[PDB]
Design an enzyme around this catalytic site. Structure first.
Site, short mmCIF file in Angstrom:
data_model
loop_
_atom_site.label_atom_id
_atom_site.label_comp_id
_atom_site.label_asym_id
_atom_site.label_seq_id
_atom_site.Cartn_x
_atom_site.Cartn_y
_atom_site.Cartn_z
N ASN A 109 -0.66 -13.62 -33.69
CA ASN A 109 0.53 -14.41 -33.47
C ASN A 109 0.11 -15.77 -32.92
O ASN A 109 -0.72 -16.47 -33.54
CB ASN A 109 1.54 -13.68 -32.56
CG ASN A 109 2.93 -14.29 -32.64
OD1 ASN A 109 3.27 -14.90 -33.66
ND2 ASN A 109 3.70 -14.20 -31.56
N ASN A 159 2.20 -14.64 -27.18
CA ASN A 159 2.88 -15.89 -27.50
C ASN A 159 2.28 -17.11 -26.78
O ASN A 159 1.04 -17.23 -26.76
CB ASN A 159 4.38 -15.73 -27.26
CG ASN A 159 5.16 -15.81 -28.56
OD1 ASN A 159 4.82 -16.61 -29.44
ND2 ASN A 159 6.20 -14.96 -28.71
N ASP A 211 8.83 -17.89 -25.57
CA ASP A 211 8.16 -17.78 -26.86
C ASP A 211 6.99 -18.75 -26.81
O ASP A 211 6.00 -18.46 -26.14
CB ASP A 211 9.15 -18.04 -28.02
CG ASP A 211 8.61 -17.57 -29.40
OD1 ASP A 211 7.38 -17.59 -29.58
OD2 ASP A 211 9.41 -17.18 -30.31
MG LIG Z 1 5.85 -17.61 -30.87
#
Ligand SMILES: [Mg+2]
Ligand SMILES: [Hg+2]
Ligand SMILES: [Hg+2]
Length: 307
Positions: A109, A159, A211
């Site tokens: 990610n 993240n 995030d």
């Molecule tokens: Mg992200």
């Protein structure tokens, strides 16, 4: 009051993510982490292009010293893509390393170079969930020896990353934890230690999940709030201080990057993917890209990966 502008030229993204500002070419790069595409936007000339691959992607960062080459994620592989910045497909793909060859249901990610040009990035289950779901991710960095080192484990949703201006601290987001963590960062050994919560969403009535994030030249963090319809500004000088809130029309704000010729424009990606258990009706969830101006701070240009 900042001004939030929708960038009409760019359309809507399923999961727009990983914005990166290359200051030398005044170009914004970003990904769509579900549609398997990379994106290039040149604001001064109003040029937009995209590239397609057949694996899930999560970041794109120019390779230091090699114009036209980019370090990217392809599911679990870190690869070098040679791309002319306009054709719909790369010229070539060279795999550097698979970070988790035997964990078939994981993916990379979020990823970012630290200020020394080392790539840091984390993995997660492909079917990770919110607020609860499989917890299978770890945090890595890639050394100029093409060998990975693991720094943290038990990560739900790997993240946002950022580092302090003096290279003494690293900031990190596991979205599943609903907080921003800080670590002591040793630049000499690339070791992190002394994990401590910096900012806890529940303590401040902030809805949604942290995030992506970035840091400004005053040392403040700017954090995208997925399912909070906002970006928040928080202090790194003292724990649990919310400094400011900027509302973004799209509820699923995903990440942020300073850009523009003076590094004082904040580019904001979002996600149009409509999820189970959204706090927002479908008509609201679009996935546009935004520019935020008038924040009164500057940030830094994106760092290239040295590799
Ligand atoms: Mg992200
Ligand atoms: Hg591309
Ligand atoms: Hg590409």
């Amino acid at each position: 009051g900042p001004v939030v502008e929708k960038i009409a030229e760019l359309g809507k993204y399923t999961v727009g993510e990983g914005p990166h500002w290359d200051h030398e070419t005044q170009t914004l790069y970003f990904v769509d982490t579900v549609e398997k595409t990379f994106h290039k936007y040149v604001p001064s000339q109003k040029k937009y292009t995209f590239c397609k691959v057949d694996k899930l992607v999560s970041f794109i960062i120019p390779l230091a010293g090699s114009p036209g080459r980019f370090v990217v994620s392809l599911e679990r592989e870190i690869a070098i893509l040679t791309w002319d910045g306009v054709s719909a497909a790369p010229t070539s793909i060279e795999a550097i390393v698979n970070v988790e060859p035997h964990i078939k249901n994981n993916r990379l990610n979020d990823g970012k170079a630290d200020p020394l040009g080392n790539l840091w990035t984390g993995t997660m289950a492909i079917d990770a969930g919110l607020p609860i779901g499989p917890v299978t991710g770890s945090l890595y960095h890639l050394g100029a020896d093409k060998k990975v080192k693991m720094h943290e484990s038990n990560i739900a949703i790997a993240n946002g990353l950022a580092w302090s201006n003096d290279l003494k601290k690293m900031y990190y987001i596991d979205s599943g934890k609903r907080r921003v963590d800080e670590y002591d960062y040793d630049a000499s050994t690339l070791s992190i230690s002394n994990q401590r919560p910096l900012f806890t969403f529940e303590k401040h009535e902030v809805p949604g999940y942290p995030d992506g994030q970035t840091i400004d030249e005053e040392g403040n963090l700017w954090v995208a709030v997925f399912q909070g319809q906002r970006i928040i500004k928080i202090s790194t000088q003292q724990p649990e201080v919310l400094l400011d809130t900027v509302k973004i029309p799209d509820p699923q704000v995903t990440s942020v990057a300073f850009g523009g010729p003076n590094l004082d424009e904040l580019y904001v990606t979002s996600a149009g993917l409509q999820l189970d258990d959204s706090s927002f009706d479908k008509s609201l969830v679009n996935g546009h890209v935004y520019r935020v101006t008038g924040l009164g701070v500057k940030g830094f240009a994106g760092v290239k990966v040295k590799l």
